[PDB]
Amino acid sequence: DTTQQLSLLKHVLSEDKRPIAFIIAAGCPVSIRHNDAPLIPDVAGLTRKISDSLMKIIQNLKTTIPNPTIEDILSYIRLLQQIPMSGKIHDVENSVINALEESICELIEEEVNVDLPGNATPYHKIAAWINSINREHQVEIFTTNYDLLMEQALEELNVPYFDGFVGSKRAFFDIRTIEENKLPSRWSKLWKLHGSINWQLDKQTQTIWRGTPSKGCSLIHPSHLKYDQSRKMPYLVMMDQLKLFLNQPSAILITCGYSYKDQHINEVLSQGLQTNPNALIYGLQYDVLENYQEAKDMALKRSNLILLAKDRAIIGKKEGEWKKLGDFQHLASFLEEISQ
Amino acid sequence: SYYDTTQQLSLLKHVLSEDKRPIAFIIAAGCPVSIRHNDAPLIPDVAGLTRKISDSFSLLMKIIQNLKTTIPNPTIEDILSYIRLLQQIPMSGKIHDVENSVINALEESICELIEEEVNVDLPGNATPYHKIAAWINSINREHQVEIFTTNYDLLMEQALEELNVPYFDGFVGSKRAFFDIRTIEENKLPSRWSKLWKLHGSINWQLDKQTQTIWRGTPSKGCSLIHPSHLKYMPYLVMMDQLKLFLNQPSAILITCGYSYKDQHINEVLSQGLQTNPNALIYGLQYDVLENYQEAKDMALKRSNLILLAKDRAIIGKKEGEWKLFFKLGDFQHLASFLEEISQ
Amino acid sequence: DTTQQLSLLKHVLSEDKRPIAFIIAAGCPVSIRHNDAPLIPDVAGLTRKISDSLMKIIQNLKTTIPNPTIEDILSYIRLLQQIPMSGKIHDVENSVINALEESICELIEEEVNVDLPGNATPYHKIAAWINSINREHQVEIFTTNYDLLMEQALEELNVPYFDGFVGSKRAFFDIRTIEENKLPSRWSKLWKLHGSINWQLDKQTQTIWRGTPSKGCSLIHPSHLKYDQSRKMPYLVMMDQLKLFLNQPSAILITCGYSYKDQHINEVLSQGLQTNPNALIYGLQYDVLENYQEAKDMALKRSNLILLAKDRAIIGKKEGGDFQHLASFLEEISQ
Amino acid sequence: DIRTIEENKLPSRWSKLWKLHGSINWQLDKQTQTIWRGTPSKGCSLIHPSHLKYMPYLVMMDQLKLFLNQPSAILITCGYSYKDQHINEV
Amino acid sequence: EASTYIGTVQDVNGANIRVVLDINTISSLKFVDGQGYRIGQIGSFVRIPIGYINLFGIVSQVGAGAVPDKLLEVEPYGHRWISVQLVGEEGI
């Protein structure tokens, strides 16, 4: 029954012991509505916003790819601009690919620059719950979004957090302090895998510094050359920190809004689940259970993964059935009730 | 009655070469003066700033004469304090007999002028600040080196970023960078991480709305909390407490460069710390004749564990004496070169 | 209904091993009747009495502020005092300010110099209830009144109390007694946020020595200069002690007559509520529940905040008073 | 196998032979999308220097870096031209 | 304790004192009103005040050579003892 699952989750998460971590996908801004409209729409919303904003590339990729997203388009544009004479596909005198890249990048940065509403935000409830627990095992948060909403709310709640960058308006990328891990217990870690809207590269070298949002320029979906390594690291070290948290004794993990559509994430989570049998994952789905074939396959393969959706509840690599927590506001309310 | 420069230099070299004993610093307005990009220094001194305010702006000059009746030649801090006091009283415009809102316009104008004058970048990698930053990274000390500054610019921050020097100034956050006060007193910071405190504030301070929560970030137009202490009913108090607490550490050493000891609260705190802890040592470094510093000589006569270094005078252990001008360490660049040579 | 939280408060009073305290406002002595009249005049009554004894400054302050209180008037007078040539702001000849403040201080001095009545005072009942409990957790009470009625009540039953001061007619301010906080559990502690007419400063240095009430000078509403490296006239030490008491293991605390009209107190209360999750404030409201907007906002923001009023009760951030009645209830619970 | 490489409890006598660029007996069968080693087939190979498949290459590079972190480690290079960039940086 | 303080006498053999360096180690500077003197050097002098007059002595051995027998058996990892040899004294 659902009630037994909820009670077990309450008495395993609310208990102070194993470390806690969350993953936040692009679906979280969908569940918050401002002026009867979502604050930030889904990925498809941004895609057809760009579309209504040169379809040739779109149908060129459509020949071998299904309905695309922005990340594929920008990766294709980057792959084009690696080649010097890349215009043979589209006319000559290369300017469109560049102009398209800037136009889309500042368009996205303008679309995402949104201010959080008042004190009713569920992020405030999550931050309050985080401040309500003083366990030695701190809570590290992984996000696939691009906005500043979560850390904005956390700062509005007066709580510390470390995101791998230290300094000022020209803060560099701290690298070693990531893996000495010599940080206060009260501090928490925030990792954004796909990047932020304020990171900017440098002409001298790959600095990926964090500070005041650079005019127009921004770094989204890191996929450039990685031969140099060390510099332009955050992507690899983000996955590395994810893998280290997946390993080690950690009998707790929560998911929220993840669509299980990332190959680089599905593979690493499967590897961690296979390597660590003691750890458990509580992946959810704010949709019908049938929309996630990859999640169903992962649940069938690895028993440690627990998949729950509106349609039914897959427990122990076996399909179940009912006889509420999908809503993210409902999730925040449940967290507040558990804390209180 | 006669002192040898080489003995003191060797003593300082032995002191800095130590690792476990805590070290600190004070960077005053006289340090950026010793670095020049144009013919003039990249940042003027306090007297230069006062002169620029005076000649850049009969009603305006009344305030300067009004304060001079009970005090010596007014400075930037005195003028700003007087403007703050005037804004504290609602109907305070009758003293200057100029409406009741021109004070706010003057405050905005002077704040904008100060921000424009101070928001400068230090050119070249050969600056003494970079040398100090490199010296900090040279020796992996058991206790990190703290830095106290009373300036308004961000030269130290930029120098620290340029050489990849981690630090922590009491502010955590990427967008708003709210002031975290529990982690300061908890003090379980990373061992390698250094600390930097700006006692008089800088251009990155902005005051919020009625919430009044303090935050740091990109400076905004018509807003700069460069006020030295201003008033309240606060970061300044906890910073003073941090300095006093550090001064009580066993065998602690504090080094001052470019500081004229003109302030009163700082001198009182230093005297209280020196009296409380009999093992602390302070190196007072000057770049002038000691006769200019009455408060410094009074404190050096009162206290026994205070050492003063001037161009032609020195007071050691309550016994004023003469050198064997001399003591070229008073200049900031020479101190940086000494530190770099010690590290190498 | 009411029986629920009545039994709850009785049980938590019966729950030992946790510290207890109370907050005394101006309402509790005002509601005390002496000769069919209030023992201490209210804030409105005090302002009316002051006005009974140069309203240009009041009119100027009324432009940006509603009907003020004595604290605002005295703060404005002092603020003009620090400014040397502040007389030109309001007329001329800035000597009326000193005479006006001296007269106001004198008027307040003989206004609050009222002796406590006989054994019928509920203060005696509160002291007896406190002394009847042998719990190791001492009770520290902070008040806002400018009198010493509670001092007389506590001294009438030979109950040990400490107000941060000790000595004689020139008793000084022992600073580190709060620092190490090493006192016997039998003793109790007292703090006056705004002070009484007992404290008086010194000309040579800011010593705010306590002793026999000096003629002319009295210390009230500490807001003077704090550039003397503390110990000048510190209410900050009392605020820090309150913060420390909020930082110890969580306990449910009550208050009497608080109007939630102190921004400095409200800010530290919110900070303590945020820092300590289980911290509970049992502040009541001997008036209409809609007359306390700040209390309702605090209850809505802080779930642990508990608010009770004559017409309603805000429990668990959801809406749903006499000092003598509280004293009688405590006495009944003690037996 | 990926667990036994990183747990590193192997017999002290057993040697190790890591291939940083793959060999001719490495084949990808697709379908299940799993890498396996077996008989050298005709045409099917995994010659890739680095590839961009959705990886053993990073595992071997991490193994090399981990070995270089051991106390008092010695590494002899013979026949290397140093024209590679990833190996030089590592 | 007051400045110019080193340790405590823990042995006496007529004219060969054995002294224990105190727990506040790692310092090895012991600043005294400006200049600091390294603690327990070979040629340095020490002073032992007894009531009204002071006893002076010269260090001769530093380290494991000065510690007594039983302490080494108790713990061989601790060598914070010095061997002071008396020289003279200062009267009233």
Added chain:
Amino acid sequence: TEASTYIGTVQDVNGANIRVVLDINTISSLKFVDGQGYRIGQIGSFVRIPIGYINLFGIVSQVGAGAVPDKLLEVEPYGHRWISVQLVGEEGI
């Protein structure tokens, strides 16, 4: 932690006869420094003792059970990791 060119710590002084305990965990053979192979303390080799700003030099005179102090042999007779160093000169500023 400890930088390269590290051998041990002084544990006994007798005027001009220093005794040093080797703090190397094991493998007293070819401690590589600056790509050149130097050996752990040997009879004909020198050592350097830095004091703040000047470096004292010395020469090894005895290695093994001879350099062990007086009663350390009495406490344990099977421990031999000491060397005896005699000071020679110093390098100034």
